[PDB]
């Protein structure tokens, strides 16, 4: 609830949005082609 508490939960949420979810779907597809092509 506190401002500084909320800020961290906002920053962590925005973090995963740019870093993980951005690349989770594409990286798995790529690896499947790599193995399917070998």
């Amino acid at each position: 609830r506190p401002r500084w508490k909320r800020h961290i939960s906002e920053q962590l949420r925005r973090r995963d949005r740019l870093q993980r979810q951005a690349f989770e779907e594409i990286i798995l597809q790529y690896n499947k082609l790599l193995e399917k092509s070998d």
Binding site: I8, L12, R20, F23, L34
Partner: protein, 255 residues
Amino acid sequence: DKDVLRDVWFGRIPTCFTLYQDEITEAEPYYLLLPRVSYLTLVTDKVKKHFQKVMDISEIWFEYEGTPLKWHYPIGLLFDLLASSSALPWNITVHFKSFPEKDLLHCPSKDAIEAHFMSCMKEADALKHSQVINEMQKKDHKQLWMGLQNDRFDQFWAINRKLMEYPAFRYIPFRIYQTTTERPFIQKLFRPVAADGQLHTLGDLLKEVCPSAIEKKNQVMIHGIEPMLETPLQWLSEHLSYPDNFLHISIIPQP
């Protein structure tokens, strides 16, 4: 605040493992999501499986911008201290030869990491705890590792809550890493409560330990975020600490 604990545990870093130009061989990059809380050793096997098809000997070592990566530092800190500024993904160059004597020995052996990982806990507990790790059985110790190795939040944190509760911490386990400092990092004693019992602040920690943070405006980054300095120091040690019960804090420049 179980919400913060899960967000930190399930944080990932997109990483692109490219093979060096000299390495013998058509090799294509390997894309992998790295657990910020884990260590490069655990993810190394998948890198060996992909590039082994193209090869020589498997004494592997990773470099970023030409500086080898340290197996003992968590993946999260390494990216934060070195790569946070550059664009994603984390561009790592994989090497299989020219092994350096300045870097750590060949990729540590599974237990050598568990050993190092538990040493950081027993040390950490000594700063915050009497003792608790000495109370719990050697049966639980395998649960803390298995939870981290297998990325099982529940299995890991069930035991780790005892390490984060304090009777109605004596010191805060922390290591402040600086990109451009002679020493590797700055670790010292610091209490979560002042002489008057008031909660200590992230700014207070730096003020006493690393005052050089406050021309060349620095950036205090933990787990890939800039948490405002008002943050009580205990709650960080309870929630934003890495699985090894340590707060790895990065001092980074700015654009």
